[PDB]
Design a protein around this nucleic acid. Structure first.
Ligand code: NA
Ligand code: NA
Length: 327
DNA sequence: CCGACTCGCATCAGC
DNA sequence: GCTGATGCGA
DNA sequence: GTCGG
């Protein structure tokens, strides 16, 4: 649907969602508004009334009333008010800094720290993650065109194989589904030496090499199985420097690898659909495994999986190409 | 009427 | 010092 | 806030 159809409504609901998450700290109300925003964004008609929208799954009485007010007035009194609220708008804004959630935003604003400038003046009140998020505030809100993602993939796959040619690496997310742009890079990594029933340095090796060739620039968090950090393509010639990008790297045991690939390939809606159809067939699918359900409901031991296709097969489904996986 | 809506890592709260 | 809870982002 | 047991 064209944005101009119900964009005013969906924008309204999305903004309400953010204030619930960031100010009221009501995560379930936050997801409630988003679900309403999503289902309305997919609605192929311009909504004439709240009663019309209430027919959609996820839109209840309260949102129906809000839509009635928005349609009749072009705004929402409650939204208009919280917009001009200095405390609430500042709390909501500060959460745009990676590492600053609803709680940290509240505490900062409570003691008079409201803007990026205020943040820049009080660095010693920020933890390591928050300083990085502050440093790359602008870059982290930029999207990544696919050509840059492709070049990022080149470096990752090359350096990973250089460390150990027996590594297996897959760039997932929307990029694997063939998207024109990405919000970040999500790399899934495994090695034949690493299983569920199984060195605790396989991830470090790869991270270290990507640091050595100056691809990885910063580290947000790093353990034995999960890395979260910052990277940057090398600058061409005398061209303008590339934005710094968010990159995650996960080490997954061989026997759980392809369940992970599927899950982190998405999309969420596709994964939702697929999980629903998994159930009726008598299988349970999560990030790690696909399991067989006993006659009451007792899940037996995880089924052997050696590819994405294996999973699709178990539930008597035919392989859907990553490009065909938005639903 | 009222409960539902996973986990790795960094850091806090408390012993 | 360690264990468990919480915040955060995914 | 919405859904549903
Ligand atoms: Na509804
Ligand atoms: Na944040």
């Amino acid at each position: 649907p064209q944005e101009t159809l119900n964009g005013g409504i969906t924008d309204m609901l999305t903004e309400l969602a953010n204030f619930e998450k960031n100010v009221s700290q009501a995560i379930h109300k936050y997801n409630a508004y988003r679900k309403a925003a999503s289902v309305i964004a997919k609605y192929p008609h311009k909504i004439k009334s709240g009663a019309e929208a209430k027919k959609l799954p996820g839109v209840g009485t309260k949102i129906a009333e809000k839509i009635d007010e928005f349609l009749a007035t072009g705004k929402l009194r409650k939204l208009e008010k919280i917009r001009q609220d200095d405390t609430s708008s500042s709390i909501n804004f500060l959460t745009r800094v990676s590492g600053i959630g609803p709680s940290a935003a509240r505490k900062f604003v409570d003691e008079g720290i409201k803007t990026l400038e205020d943040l820049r003046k009080n660095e010693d009140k920020l933890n390591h993650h928050q300083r990085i998020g502050l440093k790359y505030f602008g870059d982290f809100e930029k999207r990544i065109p696919r050509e840059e993602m492709l070049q990022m993939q080149d470096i990752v796959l090359n350096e990973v194989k250089k460390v150990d040619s027996e590594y297996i690496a897959t760039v997932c997310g929307s990029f694997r589904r063939g998207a024109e742009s990405s919000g970040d890079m999500d790399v899934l990594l495994t090695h034949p030496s690493f299983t569920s029933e199984s060195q605790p340095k396989l991830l470090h090796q790869v991270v270290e090499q990507l640091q050595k060739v100056h691809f990885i620039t910063d580290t947000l968090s790093k353990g034995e199985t999960k890395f979260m950090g910052v990277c940057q393509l090398p600058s061409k010639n005398d061209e303008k420097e590339y934005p710094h990008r968010r990159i995650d790297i996960r080490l997954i045991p061989k026997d759980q690898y392809y369940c992970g690939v599927l899950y982190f390939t998405g999309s969420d809606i596709f994964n939702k659909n697929m999980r629903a159809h998994a159930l009726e067939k008598g299988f349970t699918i999560n990030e790690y495994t696909i399991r067989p359900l006993g006659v009451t409901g007792v899940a037996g031991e995880p089924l052997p999986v050696d590819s994405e296709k294996d999973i699709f097969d178990y539930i008597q489904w035919k392989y859907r190409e990553p490009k065909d996986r938005s639903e």
